[PDB]
């Protein structure tokens, strides 16, 4: 019912957090290289 949905929200949100971390790191690397 809802447990399935709340679980899916948790699973997707976790993936999002990790990509956000990756974007932040990649943006740092790019700034270094371009500067």
């Amino acid at each position: 019912e809802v447990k399935q949905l709340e679980a899916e929200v948790e699973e997707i949100e976790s993936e999002v957090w990790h990509l956000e971390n990756e974007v932040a790191r990649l943006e740092k690397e790019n700034a270094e290289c371009e500067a």
Partner: protein, 35 residues
Amino acid sequence: KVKQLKAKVEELKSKLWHLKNKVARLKKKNAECKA
């Protein structure tokens, strides 16, 4: 409740897809820059 969580799930999936494309672009840019 079902409806409210369903929207959240769809919001998260779209944010996830945008992030995957951003990460792919940033990895390409950095690869090219370092090259």
